[PDB]
Amino acid sequence: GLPKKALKESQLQFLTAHQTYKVSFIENGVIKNAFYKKLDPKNHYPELLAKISVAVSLFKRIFQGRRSAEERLVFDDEERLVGTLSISVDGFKGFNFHKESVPQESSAKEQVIPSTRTLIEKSFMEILLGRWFLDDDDGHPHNLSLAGDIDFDMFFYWFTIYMKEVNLTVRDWEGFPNVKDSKPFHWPTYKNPGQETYPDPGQFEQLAHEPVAQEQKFAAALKILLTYQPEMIRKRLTELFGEMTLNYTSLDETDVALRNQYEKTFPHLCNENTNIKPFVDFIMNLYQMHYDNLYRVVVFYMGCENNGYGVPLPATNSALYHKPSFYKDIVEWARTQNITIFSKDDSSIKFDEDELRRRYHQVWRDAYAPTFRDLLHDSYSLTNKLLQQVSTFHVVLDEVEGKKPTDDTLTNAWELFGTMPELSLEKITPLISVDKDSKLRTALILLVEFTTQFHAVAKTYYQKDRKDLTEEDNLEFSEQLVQLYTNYNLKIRQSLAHTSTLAGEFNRIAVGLKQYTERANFQLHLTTTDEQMKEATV
Numbered sequence: 001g002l003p004k005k006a007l008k009e010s011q012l013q014f015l016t017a018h019q020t021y022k023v024s025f026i027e028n029g030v031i032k033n034a035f036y037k038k039l040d041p042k043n044h045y046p047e048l049l050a051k052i053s054v055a056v057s058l059f060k061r062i063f064q065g066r067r068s069a070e071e072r073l074v075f076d077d078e079e080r081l082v083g084t085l086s087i088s089v090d091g092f093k094g095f096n097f098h099k100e101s102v103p104q105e106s107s108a109k110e111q112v113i114p115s116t117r118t119l120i121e122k123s124f125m126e127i128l129l130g131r132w133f134l135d136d137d138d139g140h141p142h143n144l145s146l147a148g149d150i151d152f153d154m155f156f157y158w159f160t161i162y163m164k165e166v167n168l169t170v171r172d173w174e175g176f177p178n179v180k181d182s183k184p185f186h187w188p189t190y191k192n193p194g195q196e197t198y199p200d201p202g203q204f205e206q207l208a209h210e211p212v213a214q215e216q217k218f219a220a221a222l223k224i225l226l227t228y229q230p231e232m233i234r235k236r237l238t239e240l241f242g243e244m245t246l247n248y249t250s251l252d253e254t255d256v257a258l259r260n261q262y263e264k265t266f267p268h269l270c271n272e273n274t275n276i277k278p279f280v281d282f283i284m285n286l287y288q289m290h291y292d293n294l295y296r297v298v299v300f301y302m303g304c305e306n307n308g309y310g311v312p313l314p315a316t317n318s319a320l321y322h323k324p325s326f327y328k329d330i331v332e333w334a335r336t337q338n339i340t341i342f343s344k345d346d347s348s349i350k351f352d353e354d355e356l357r358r359r360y361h362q363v364w365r366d367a368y369a370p371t372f373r374d375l376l377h378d379s380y381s382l383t384n385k386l387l388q389q390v391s392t393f394h395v396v397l398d399e400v401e402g403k404k405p406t407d408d409t410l411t412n413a414w415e416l417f418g419t420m421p422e423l424s425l426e427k428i429t430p431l432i433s434v435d436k437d438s439k440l441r442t443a444l445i446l447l448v449e450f451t452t453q454f455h456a457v458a459k460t461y462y463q464k465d466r467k468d469l470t471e472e473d474n475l476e477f478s479e480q481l482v483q484l485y486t487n488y489n490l491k492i493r494q495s496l497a498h499t500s501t502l503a504g505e506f507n508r509i510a511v512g513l514k515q516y517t518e519r520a521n522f523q524l525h526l527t528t529t530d531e532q533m534k535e536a537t538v
Protein backbone atom coordinates (compact mmCIF):
# COMPACT_ATOMS: atom_id res chain seq x y z
CA GLY A 1 0.00 0.00 0.00
CA LEU A 2 1.66 3.16 1.30
CA PRO A 3 4.73 3.59 3.55
CA LYS A 4 4.67 2.92 7.29
CA LYS A 5 5.68 6.46 8.33
CA ALA A 6 3.70 8.19 5.57
CA LEU A 7 0.59 10.27 6.19
CA LYS A 8 -2.52 11.07 4.15
CA GLU A 9 -3.73 14.59 3.40
CA SER A 10 -7.10 13.46 4.79
CA GLN A 11 -5.42 12.92 8.19
CA LEU A 12 -4.32 16.56 8.56
CA GLN A 13 -6.07 19.27 10.59
CA PHE A 14 -5.29 22.57 8.87
CA LEU A 15 -4.75 25.50 11.25
CA THR A 16 -5.30 28.25 8.63
CA ALA A 17 -8.91 27.78 7.47
CA HIS A 18 5.64 27.43 -2.44
CA GLN A 19 2.12 26.38 -1.39
CA THR A 20 3.01 26.26 2.31
CA TYR A 21 0.20 25.53 4.78
CA LYS A 22 0.33 25.16 8.56
CA VAL A 23 -0.79 21.69 9.66
CA SER A 24 -1.24 19.50 12.73
CA PHE A 25 -1.75 15.75 13.01
CA ILE A 26 -1.70 12.83 15.45
CA GLU A 27 1.36 10.63 16.02
CA ASN A 28 1.91 8.04 18.76
CA GLY A 29 -0.99 9.45 20.75
CA VAL A 30 0.13 13.09 20.71
CA ILE A 31 -0.30 16.01 18.32
CA LYS A 32 2.66 17.25 16.26
CA ASN A 33 2.51 20.62 14.53
CA ALA A 34 4.21 20.81 11.14
CA PHE A 35 4.41 22.65 7.81
CA TYR A 36 2.84 21.25 4.63
CA LYS A 37 4.18 21.66 1.09
CA LYS A 38 2.13 20.54 -1.91
CA LEU A 39 3.61 19.02 -5.06
CA ASP A 40 3.66 21.50 -7.96
CA PRO A 41 5.18 19.55 -10.87
CA LYS A 42 4.70 22.56 -13.17
CA ASN A 43 6.41 24.98 -10.77
CA HIS A 44 9.51 23.03 -9.77
CA TYR A 45 9.33 20.74 -6.70
CA PRO A 46 8.34 17.62 -8.74
CA GLU A 47 7.69 14.18 -7.25
CA LEU A 48 11.30 12.93 -7.30
CA LEU A 49 12.64 16.26 -6.02
CA ALA A 50 10.12 16.18 -3.19
CA LYS A 51 10.98 12.51 -2.67
CA ILE A 52 14.67 13.38 -2.25
CA SER A 53 13.89 16.16 0.24
CA VAL A 54 12.35 13.66 2.65
CA ALA A 55 15.32 11.29 2.46
CA VAL A 56 17.68 14.20 3.17
CA SER A 57 15.66 15.03 6.30
CA LEU A 58 16.33 11.50 7.59
CA PHE A 59 20.00 11.32 6.59
CA LYS A 60 20.57 14.59 8.46
CA ARG A 61 18.62 13.58 11.57
CA ILE A 62 20.91 10.55 11.96
CA PHE A 63 23.87 12.80 12.79
CA GLN A 64 22.00 15.99 13.81
CA GLY A 65 19.07 14.66 15.87
CA ARG A 66 16.37 17.20 16.74
CA ARG A 67 18.29 19.99 14.99
CA SER A 68 17.09 18.79 11.56
CA ALA A 69 13.38 18.77 10.79
CA GLU A 70 12.02 15.33 9.90
CA GLU A 71 9.94 15.32 6.73
CA ARG A 72 7.23 12.85 5.75
CA LEU A 73 5.43 11.76 2.59
CA VAL A 74 1.74 12.67 2.40
CA PHE A 75 -0.63 10.89 0.00
CA ASP A 76 -4.22 11.45 -1.03
CA ASP A 77 -6.98 9.00 -0.14
CA GLU A 78 -6.18 6.96 -3.29
CA GLU A 79 -2.49 6.26 -2.55
CA ARG A 80 -1.04 9.03 -4.72
CA LEU A 81 1.72 11.38 -3.60
CA VAL A 82 0.53 14.96 -3.15
CA GLY A 83 3.20 16.68 -1.08
CA THR A 84 5.64 16.55 1.81
CA LEU A 85 5.59 17.48 5.48
CA SER A 86 8.16 19.06 7.81
CA ILE A 87 7.54 18.61 11.53
CA SER A 88 8.13 21.89 13.34
CA VAL A 89 11.56 22.24 14.95
CA ASP A 90 11.06 23.02 18.63
CA GLY A 91 12.71 26.38 19.25
CA PHE A 92 13.00 27.64 15.66
CA LYS A 93 13.23 31.43 15.30
CA GLY A 94 15.00 31.59 11.92
CA PHE A 95 17.40 34.32 10.78
CA ASN A 96 16.72 37.89 9.70
CA PHE A 97 16.91 39.52 6.31
CA HIS A 98 18.57 42.92 6.04
CA LYS A 99 15.10 44.26 5.09
CA GLU A 100 13.37 43.05 8.27
CA SER A 101 13.05 44.67 11.67
CA VAL A 102 15.85 44.50 14.24
CA PRO A 103 14.30 43.59 17.62
CA GLN A 104 14.86 46.11 20.39
CA GLU A 105 15.79 43.54 23.04
CA SER A 106 19.40 42.61 22.32
CA SER A 107 18.68 39.11 23.66
CA ALA A 108 16.01 38.51 21.00
CA LYS A 109 17.98 39.76 17.98
CA GLU A 110 20.98 37.67 19.03
CA GLN A 111 18.68 34.81 17.98
CA VAL A 112 17.47 36.44 14.75
CA ILE A 113 20.78 38.05 13.76
CA PRO A 114 23.39 36.24 15.89
CA SER A 115 26.74 37.51 17.10
CA THR A 116 29.72 35.41 16.04
CA ARG A 117 30.38 34.48 19.68
CA THR A 118 26.77 33.40 20.25
CA LEU A 119 27.00 31.07 17.24
CA ILE A 120 29.74 29.10 19.03
CA GLU A 121 27.74 28.92 22.27
CA LYS A 122 24.79 27.36 20.40
CA SER A 123 26.92 25.10 18.16
CA PHE A 124 25.93 26.41 14.74
CA MET A 125 29.01 24.96 13.03
CA GLU A 126 27.36 21.52 13.14
CA ILE A 127 24.45 22.84 11.06
CA LEU A 128 26.46 24.69 8.42
CA LEU A 129 28.68 21.65 7.83
CA GLY A 130 25.68 19.40 7.22
CA ARG A 131 24.40 21.74 4.52
CA TRP A 132 27.84 21.74 2.88
CA PHE A 133 28.18 17.97 3.30
CA LEU A 134 25.14 17.33 1.07
CA ASP A 135 25.74 20.28 -1.30
CA ASP A 136 22.93 22.60 -0.27
CA ASP A 137 22.42 25.66 -2.46
CA ASP A 138 19.77 27.51 -0.42
CA GLY A 139 21.63 28.54 2.72
CA HIS A 140 19.58 31.73 2.90
CA PRO A 141 18.49 33.25 6.23
CA HIS A 142 14.98 31.82 6.68
CA ASN A 143 16.12 28.22 6.06
CA LEU A 144 18.57 28.43 8.99
CA SER A 145 18.03 28.83 12.73
CA LEU A 146 20.10 28.94 15.90
CA ALA A 147 18.68 25.52 16.83
CA GLY A 148 18.28 23.69 13.51
CA ASP A 149 17.56 23.73 9.80
CA ILE A 150 14.31 22.97 8.01
CA ASP A 151 14.48 23.54 4.24
CA PHE A 152 15.93 20.78 2.06
CA ASP A 153 14.30 21.38 -1.34
CA MET A 154 17.70 22.49 -2.73
CA PHE A 155 19.99 19.69 -1.56
CA PHE A 156 22.15 17.51 -3.81
CA TYR A 157 22.77 20.60 -5.94
CA TRP A 158 24.85 18.64 -8.46
CA PHE A 159 21.90 16.33 -9.23
CA THR A 160 18.86 18.48 -8.38
CA ILE A 161 19.68 21.87 -9.92
CA TYR A 162 17.83 20.96 -13.12
CA MET A 163 14.40 21.04 -11.42
CA LYS A 164 14.76 24.61 -10.10
CA GLU A 165 15.97 26.82 -12.96
CA VAL A 166 29.74 16.35 -5.83
CA ASN A 167 33.19 17.75 -5.05
CA LEU A 168 33.91 18.52 -1.40
CA THR A 169 37.60 19.42 -1.45
CA VAL A 170 40.24 19.63 1.26
CA ARG A 171 40.57 23.33 0.44
CA ASP A 172 37.00 23.91 1.62
CA TRP A 173 37.48 21.73 4.71
CA GLU A 174 40.44 23.89 5.76
CA GLY A 175 38.87 27.34 5.54
CA PHE A 176 35.34 26.36 6.56
CA PRO A 177 32.67 27.91 6.63
CA ASN A 178 34.31 30.14 4.00
CA VAL A 179 33.54 27.65 1.22
CA LYS A 180 34.76 28.78 -2.20
CA ASP A 181 35.55 25.71 -4.32
CA SER A 182 32.07 24.42 -3.45
CA LYS A 183 30.05 27.39 -4.67
CA PRO A 184 26.55 27.75 -3.17
CA PHE A 185 24.27 30.66 -4.04
CA HIS A 186 23.19 31.65 -0.52
CA TRP A 187 25.69 31.25 2.31
CA PRO A 188 26.11 33.00 5.68
CA THR A 189 29.72 34.00 4.95
CA TYR A 190 28.70 35.62 1.66
CA LYS A 191 28.05 39.35 1.80
CA ASN A 192 26.26 39.42 -1.57
CA PRO A 193 24.31 36.31 -2.66
CA GLY A 194 26.04 34.70 -5.61
CA GLN A 195 29.40 35.92 -4.31
CA GLU A 196 31.13 32.84 -5.73
CA THR A 197 21.32 38.78 1.93
CA TYR A 198 22.43 38.46 5.54
CA PRO A 199 22.51 41.74 7.52
CA ASP A 200 25.79 40.82 9.27
CA PRO A 201 27.57 38.19 7.15
CA GLY A 202 30.98 38.92 8.68
CA GLN A 203 29.76 37.30 11.90
CA PHE A 204 29.79 33.96 10.06
CA GLU A 205 33.04 34.68 8.20
CA GLN A 206 34.90 34.91 11.52
CA LEU A 207 34.08 31.29 12.42
CA ALA A 208 36.98 30.17 10.19
CA HIS A 209 39.37 32.37 12.20
CA GLU A 210 38.35 31.12 15.65
CA PRO A 211 40.09 27.87 16.67
CA VAL A 212 37.27 26.79 19.01
CA ALA A 213 34.95 26.90 16.00
CA GLN A 214 37.24 24.52 14.12
CA GLU A 215 37.11 21.97 16.94
CA GLN A 216 33.32 22.01 16.65
CA LYS A 217 33.71 21.51 12.90
CA PHE A 218 35.84 18.42 13.48
CA ALA A 219 33.42 17.07 16.10
CA ALA A 220 30.71 17.58 13.48
CA ALA A 221 32.58 15.78 10.70
CA LEU A 222 33.36 12.89 13.04
CA LYS A 223 29.68 12.62 13.95
CA ILE A 224 28.73 12.34 10.26
CA LEU A 225 31.30 9.58 9.77
CA LEU A 226 30.62 7.53 12.92
CA THR A 227 26.80 7.70 13.07
CA TYR A 228 26.66 6.22 9.55
CA GLN A 229 25.20 2.78 10.28
CA PRO A 230 23.83 1.88 6.83
CA GLU A 231 22.17 -1.32 8.03
CA MET A 232 19.63 0.73 10.01
CA ILE A 233 19.43 3.82 7.79
CA ARG A 234 18.18 1.49 5.07
CA LYS A 235 15.55 0.12 7.46
CA ARG A 236 14.55 3.59 8.64
CA LEU A 237 14.29 4.96 5.09
CA THR A 238 11.94 2.12 4.13
CA GLU A 239 9.77 3.29 7.04
CA LEU A 240 9.31 6.58 5.14
CA PHE A 241 9.22 5.23 1.56
CA GLY A 242 8.50 1.51 1.73
CA GLU A 243 8.87 -0.21 -1.63
CA MET A 244 8.58 3.06 -3.59
CA THR A 245 10.59 2.81 -6.79
CA LEU A 246 12.91 5.54 -8.04
CA ASN A 247 10.44 6.34 -10.83
CA TYR A 248 12.23 9.29 -12.39
CA THR A 249 9.76 8.88 -15.27
CA SER A 250 7.37 11.01 -13.19
CA LEU A 251 9.27 13.95 -14.70
CA ASP A 252 7.00 13.51 -17.73
CA GLU A 253 4.20 14.99 -15.62
CA THR A 254 6.36 18.13 -15.37
CA ASP A 255 7.87 18.11 -18.88
CA VAL A 256 9.21 15.15 -20.86
CA ALA A 257 12.22 17.23 -21.92
CA LEU A 258 13.44 17.20 -18.31
CA ARG A 259 13.48 13.39 -18.15
CA ASN A 260 15.49 13.44 -21.37
CA GLN A 261 17.89 15.86 -19.68
CA TYR A 262 18.45 13.48 -16.76
CA GLU A 263 18.83 10.22 -18.70
CA LYS A 264 21.41 11.98 -20.91
CA THR A 265 23.30 13.91 -18.21
CA PHE A 266 23.27 11.14 -15.56
CA PRO A 267 23.10 7.85 -17.50
CA HIS A 268 24.58 5.76 -14.68
CA LEU A 269 21.99 6.77 -12.04
CA CYS A 270 18.51 7.27 -13.58
CA ASN A 271 17.85 5.08 -16.63
CA GLU A 272 15.31 2.50 -17.80
CA ASN A 273 16.88 -0.16 -15.57
CA THR A 274 17.14 1.91 -12.37
CA ASN A 275 13.71 3.52 -12.84
CA ILE A 276 11.97 0.38 -11.51
CA LYS A 277 14.40 -0.22 -8.62
CA PRO A 278 13.73 0.93 -5.04
CA PHE A 279 14.15 4.63 -4.35
CA VAL A 280 15.97 3.59 -1.17
CA ASP A 281 18.74 1.88 -3.14
CA PHE A 282 19.03 4.94 -5.38
CA ILE A 283 19.55 7.60 -2.70
CA MET A 284 21.66 5.29 -0.51
CA ASN A 285 23.99 4.73 -3.47
CA LEU A 286 23.79 8.51 -3.91
CA TYR A 287 24.51 9.24 -0.24
CA GLN A 288 27.54 6.95 -0.14
CA MET A 289 29.14 9.21 -2.76
CA HIS A 290 29.02 12.15 -0.35
CA TYR A 291 30.19 9.93 2.52
CA ASP A 292 33.18 8.49 0.68
CA ASN A 293 33.99 12.05 -0.44
CA LEU A 294 33.81 13.50 3.08
CA TYR A 295 35.69 10.42 4.30
CA ARG A 296 38.59 11.07 1.92
CA VAL A 297 38.83 14.74 2.90
CA VAL A 298 38.69 14.43 6.69
CA VAL A 299 39.98 11.01 7.73
CA PHE A 300 43.08 11.46 5.54
CA TYR A 301 43.66 15.14 6.33
CA MET A 302 47.33 15.66 7.23
CA GLY A 303 47.29 19.15 8.76
CA CYS A 304 47.84 22.80 7.94
CA GLU A 305 50.11 25.48 9.37
CA ASN A 306 47.58 28.25 8.70
CA ASN A 307 44.20 28.24 7.03
CA GLY A 308 43.50 31.09 4.69
CA TYR A 309 41.86 32.73 7.71
CA GLY A 310 44.21 32.32 10.68
CA VAL A 311 43.97 28.96 12.50
CA PRO A 312 46.29 25.94 12.21
CA LEU A 313 44.54 22.60 11.72
CA PRO A 314 46.01 19.31 13.02
CA ALA A 315 46.16 16.01 11.21
CA THR A 316 43.16 13.86 12.12
CA ASN A 317 45.58 11.17 13.30
CA SER A 318 46.82 13.71 15.86
CA ALA A 319 43.42 15.21 16.68
CA LEU A 320 41.98 11.78 17.48
CA TYR A 321 45.07 10.76 19.45
CA HIS A 322 45.37 14.03 21.39
CA LYS A 323 41.62 14.35 22.14
CA PRO A 324 40.06 10.93 22.83
CA SER A 325 36.90 12.70 24.05
CA PHE A 326 35.72 13.17 20.45
CA TYR A 327 34.75 9.50 20.25
CA LYS A 328 33.59 9.40 23.88
CA ASP A 329 31.20 12.28 23.14
CA ILE A 330 29.73 10.69 20.01
CA VAL A 331 29.03 7.52 22.01
CA GLU A 332 27.30 9.50 24.76
CA TRP A 333 25.37 11.59 22.22
CA ALA A 334 24.29 8.35 20.52
CA ARG A 335 22.93 6.68 23.66
CA THR A 336 21.22 9.99 24.46
CA GLN A 337 19.53 10.03 21.05
CA ASN A 338 18.63 6.36 21.53
CA ILE A 339 16.52 7.20 24.60
CA THR A 340 15.39 10.59 23.25
CA ILE A 341 13.98 10.59 19.71
CA PHE A 342 14.37 6.82 19.17
CA SER A 343 12.75 5.88 22.49
CA LYS A 344 9.55 4.80 20.73
CA ASP A 345 11.48 3.21 17.84
CA ASP A 346 12.44 -0.46 17.80
CA SER A 347 15.78 -1.84 18.96
CA SER A 348 16.66 -2.83 15.38
CA ILE A 349 16.69 0.82 14.23
CA LYS A 350 18.66 2.24 17.16
CA PHE A 351 22.31 3.20 17.46
CA ASP A 352 24.27 -0.03 17.91
CA GLU A 353 27.16 0.79 20.25
CA ASP A 354 29.19 -2.20 19.03
CA GLU A 355 28.82 -1.11 15.39
CA LEU A 356 29.63 2.46 16.40
CA ARG A 357 32.83 1.19 18.03
CA ARG A 358 33.99 -0.73 14.96
CA ARG A 359 33.21 2.34 12.85
CA TYR A 360 35.50 4.45 15.02
CA HIS A 361 38.06 1.64 14.87
CA GLN A 362 37.99 1.98 11.08
CA VAL A 363 38.26 5.78 11.18
CA TRP A 364 41.13 5.30 13.63
CA ARG A 365 43.00 2.84 11.39
CA ASP A 366 42.33 4.72 8.15
CA ALA A 367 43.26 8.04 9.80
CA TYR A 368 46.80 6.63 10.09
CA ALA A 369 47.04 5.23 6.55
CA PRO A 370 48.99 8.27 5.22
CA THR A 371 51.70 8.20 7.89
CA PHE A 372 52.09 4.44 7.32
CA ARG A 373 52.16 4.78 3.54
CA ASP A 374 54.78 7.50 4.00
CA LEU A 375 56.91 5.23 6.20
CA LEU A 376 56.58 2.38 3.69
CA HIS A 377 57.41 4.71 0.80
CA ASP A 378 60.40 6.09 2.69
CA SER A 379 61.33 2.51 3.57
CA TYR A 380 60.98 1.49 -0.09
CA SER A 381 63.06 4.42 -1.35
CA LEU A 382 65.93 3.53 0.98
CA THR A 383 65.94 -0.10 -0.18
CA ASN A 384 66.53 1.14 -3.74
CA LYS A 385 69.57 3.21 -2.78
CA LEU A 386 70.99 0.10 -1.12
CA LEU A 387 70.18 -2.05 -4.16
CA GLN A 388 72.05 0.46 -6.34
CA GLN A 389 75.20 0.31 -4.22
CA VAL A 390 75.28 -3.49 -3.83
CA SER A 391 73.80 -4.94 -7.01
CA THR A 392 75.96 -5.74 -10.02
CA PHE A 393 73.65 -4.08 -12.56
CA HIS A 394 72.79 -1.15 -10.25
CA VAL A 395 69.21 -2.37 -10.16
CA VAL A 396 66.67 0.31 -9.26
CA LEU A 397 63.19 -1.02 -8.51
CA ASP A 398 60.04 0.78 -9.62
CA GLU A 399 57.31 1.62 -7.10
CA VAL A 400 53.68 1.50 -8.20
CA GLU A 401 52.16 4.50 -6.44
CA GLY A 402 48.80 4.19 -4.75
CA LYS A 403 45.74 6.27 -5.49
CA LYS A 404 45.89 9.86 -4.27
CA PRO A 405 43.72 10.90 -1.29
CA THR A 406 41.36 12.95 -3.50
CA ASP A 407 40.81 10.48 -6.35
CA ASP A 408 37.03 10.05 -6.53
CA THR A 409 37.44 6.29 -7.11
CA LEU A 410 39.03 5.81 -3.66
CA THR A 411 36.92 3.97 -1.08
CA ASN A 412 39.05 2.05 1.46
CA ALA A 413 42.41 3.14 2.82
CA TRP A 414 44.54 0.20 1.67
CA GLU A 415 44.47 1.66 -1.85
CA LEU A 416 46.67 4.55 -0.65
CA PHE A 417 49.68 2.25 -0.20
CA GLY A 418 52.11 1.87 -3.07
CA THR A 419 53.70 -1.47 -3.89
CA MET A 420 57.05 -2.76 -5.16
CA PRO A 421 56.03 -5.92 -7.05
CA GLU A 422 59.58 -7.29 -7.40
CA LEU A 423 60.65 -6.60 -3.78
CA SER A 424 61.14 -10.12 -2.46
CA LEU A 425 64.11 -11.75 -0.77
CA GLU A 426 63.84 -14.50 -3.38
CA LYS A 427 64.03 -11.91 -6.19
CA ILE A 428 66.87 -9.72 -4.85
CA THR A 429 69.40 -12.26 -3.51
CA PRO A 430 70.64 -13.22 -7.03
CA LEU A 431 70.98 -9.51 -7.90
CA ILE A 432 73.68 -8.88 -5.26
CA SER A 433 77.41 -8.77 -6.00
CA VAL A 434 79.88 -10.60 -3.76
CA ASP A 435 82.21 -7.61 -4.28
CA LYS A 436 80.55 -4.62 -2.55
CA ASP A 437 80.06 -5.40 1.16
CA SER A 438 80.99 -2.27 3.07
CA LYS A 439 78.41 -3.71 5.52
CA LEU A 440 75.92 -2.28 2.98
CA ARG A 441 75.45 -5.79 1.60
CA THR A 442 74.24 -7.03 4.99
CA ALA A 443 72.15 -3.86 5.39
CA LEU A 444 70.28 -4.44 2.12
CA ILE A 445 69.28 -7.98 3.07
CA LEU A 446 68.13 -6.70 6.47
CA LEU A 447 66.25 -3.71 5.06
CA VAL A 448 64.55 -6.02 2.54
CA GLU A 449 63.33 -8.38 5.27
CA PHE A 450 62.30 -5.33 7.30
CA THR A 451 60.32 -3.61 4.55
CA THR A 452 58.66 -6.86 3.46
CA GLN A 453 57.46 -7.70 6.97
CA PHE A 454 56.43 -4.06 7.48
CA HIS A 455 54.24 -4.03 4.37
CA ALA A 456 52.90 -7.49 5.20
CA VAL A 457 51.72 -6.42 8.66
CA ALA A 458 50.16 -3.24 7.28
CA LYS A 459 48.30 -5.29 4.67
CA THR A 460 46.81 -7.92 7.00
CA TYR A 461 45.49 -5.13 9.24
CA TYR A 462 44.41 -2.66 6.55
CA GLN A 463 42.58 -5.26 4.44
CA LYS A 464 40.31 -6.25 7.33
CA ASP A 465 36.98 -4.69 6.39
CA ARG A 466 34.74 -2.95 8.91
CA LYS A 467 32.51 -6.00 9.41
CA ASP A 468 35.51 -8.17 10.42
CA LEU A 469 37.55 -5.50 12.25
CA THR A 470 38.33 -6.79 15.74
CA GLU A 471 40.01 -4.66 18.38
CA GLU A 472 42.42 -7.60 18.55
CA ASP A 473 43.40 -6.89 14.93
CA ASN A 474 44.82 -3.54 16.03
CA LEU A 475 46.73 -5.34 18.79
CA GLU A 476 48.14 -7.82 16.27
CA PHE A 477 49.20 -4.88 14.10
CA SER A 478 50.85 -3.06 17.01
CA GLU A 479 52.43 -6.15 18.58
CA GLN A 480 54.16 -6.97 15.29
CA LEU A 481 55.44 -3.48 14.43
CA VAL A 482 56.91 -3.29 17.93
CA GLN A 483 58.41 -6.73 17.29
CA LEU A 484 59.58 -5.52 13.88
CA TYR A 485 61.25 -2.46 15.41
CA THR A 486 63.01 -4.45 18.13
CA ASN A 487 64.43 -7.01 15.67
CA TYR A 488 65.81 -4.75 12.93
CA ASN A 489 66.27 -1.25 14.38
CA LEU A 490 69.68 -1.92 15.90
CA LYS A 491 71.08 -4.41 13.39
CA ILE A 492 70.16 -2.16 10.46
CA ARG A 493 71.41 1.15 11.83
CA GLN A 494 74.58 -0.64 12.96
CA SER A 495 75.09 -1.86 9.39
CA LEU A 496 74.60 1.72 8.17
CA ALA A 497 76.80 3.22 10.91
CA HIS A 498 79.63 4.07 8.50
CA THR A 499 77.43 5.84 5.93
CA SER A 500 76.25 9.43 6.25
CA THR A 501 72.96 10.48 4.60
CA LEU A 502 72.07 6.80 4.10
CA ALA A 503 72.06 6.14 7.85
CA GLY A 504 70.17 9.31 8.80
CA GLU A 505 67.56 8.34 6.22
CA PHE A 506 66.84 5.14 8.15
CA ASN A 507 66.88 7.05 11.44
CA ARG A 508 63.74 8.91 10.39
CA ILE A 509 62.06 5.68 9.29
CA ALA A 510 62.77 4.00 12.63
CA VAL A 511 61.88 7.03 14.77
CA GLY A 512 58.57 7.40 12.95
CA LEU A 513 57.91 3.66 13.18
CA LYS A 514 58.34 3.67 16.97
CA GLN A 515 56.25 6.81 17.46
CA TYR A 516 53.31 5.67 15.31
CA THR A 517 53.48 2.07 16.50
CA GLU A 518 52.39 3.37 19.92
CA ARG A 519 50.17 6.28 18.86
CA ALA A 520 48.17 3.80 16.76
CA ASN A 521 47.48 1.40 19.65
CA PHE A 522 43.68 1.44 19.78
CA GLN A 523 43.08 -0.48 23.01
CA LEU A 524 45.43 1.93 24.79
CA HIS A 525 43.79 4.95 23.15
CA LEU A 526 40.34 4.13 24.54
CA THR A 527 41.66 4.38 28.13
CA THR A 528 43.01 7.93 27.78
CA THR A 529 41.58 11.33 28.72
CA ASP A 530 42.14 14.70 27.08
CA GLU A 531 44.23 15.83 30.05
CA GLN A 532 46.24 12.59 30.20
CA MET A 533 47.19 13.14 26.55
CA LYS A 534 48.03 16.82 27.16
CA GLU A 535 50.58 15.94 29.87
CA ALA A 536 51.98 12.88 28.08
CA THR A 537 53.41 15.09 25.30
CA VAL A 538 55.48 17.24 27.68
Ligand SMILES: Nc1ncnc2c1ncn2[C@@H]1O[C@H](COP(=O)(O)OP(=O)(O)O)[C@@H](O)[C@H]1O
Nearest residue numbers: 018020035069086087088089092094142150151
Ligand atom coordinates in the same frame (compact mmCIF):
# COMPACT_ATOMS: atom_id res chain seq x y z
N1 LIG B 1 9.93 22.41 10.34
C1 LIG B 1 9.77 23.75 10.34
N2 LIG B 1 9.88 24.47 11.48
C2 LIG B 1 9.73 25.81 11.50
N3 LIG B 1 9.46 26.54 10.40
C3 LIG B 1 9.32 25.95 9.19
C4 LIG B 1 9.47 24.49 9.10
N4 LIG B 1 9.29 24.15 7.81
C5 LIG B 1 9.04 25.29 7.12
N5 LIG B 1 9.06 26.36 7.95
C6 LIG B 1 8.83 27.75 7.50
O1 LIG B 1 8.64 27.71 6.08
C7 LIG B 1 9.58 28.55 5.40
C8 LIG B 1 10.38 27.71 4.42
O2 LIG B 1 9.47 26.91 3.67
P1 LIG B 1 9.94 26.03 2.40
O3 LIG B 1 8.90 26.20 1.31
O4 LIG B 1 10.31 24.66 2.90
O5 LIG B 1 11.27 26.78 1.89
P2 LIG B 1 11.17 27.92 0.75
O6 LIG B 1 9.98 28.74 1.18
O7 LIG B 1 12.48 28.65 0.84
O8 LIG B 1 10.96 27.15 -0.54
C9 LIG B 1 10.46 29.23 6.45
O9 LIG B 1 10.23 30.64 6.46
C10 LIG B 1 10.07 28.59 7.78
O10 LIG B 1 9.81 29.59 8.77
Ligand SMILES: [Mg+2]
Nearest residue numbers: 138151153154
Ligand atom coordinates in the same frame (compact mmCIF):
# COMPACT_ATOMS: atom_id res chain seq x y z
MG1 LIG C 1 13.47 25.93 -0.52
